Amino acid sequence: RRPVSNGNFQQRVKAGDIVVAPYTSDGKITVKLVAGQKDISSTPDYDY
């Protein structure tokens, strides 16, 4: 998280100031890896 304070923010607002600040709300980044089996060889077939 990247918090920033504009001093006496409410006093500035009461003065009528346009108050803005750059901000980055904290959050999550996730990478999931799941294995997989791959059929390397396959041939003999039969019918039933």
* Residues contacting residue 9 through CB under 8 Å, at least 6 positions apart: 19
Instruction: Report CA dihedral (33, 35, 36, 41) to the nearest 10 degrees.
Output: 130
Q: Which stretch binds another protein (CB under 8 A): 1-9, 10-18, 21-29, 40-48?
A: 40-48
Which residues on neighbouring strands pair with residue 2, listed in sequence order? Answer: 24
- Binding-residue total with another protein (CB under 8 A): 3
Q: Does 47 bind another protein (CB under 8 A)?
A: yes
Give the nearest distance from C-beta 45 to another protein in angstroms: 7
Q: Does 41 bind another protein (CB under 8 A)?
A: no
Chain residues that interact with another protein, rule: CB under 8 A: 45-47
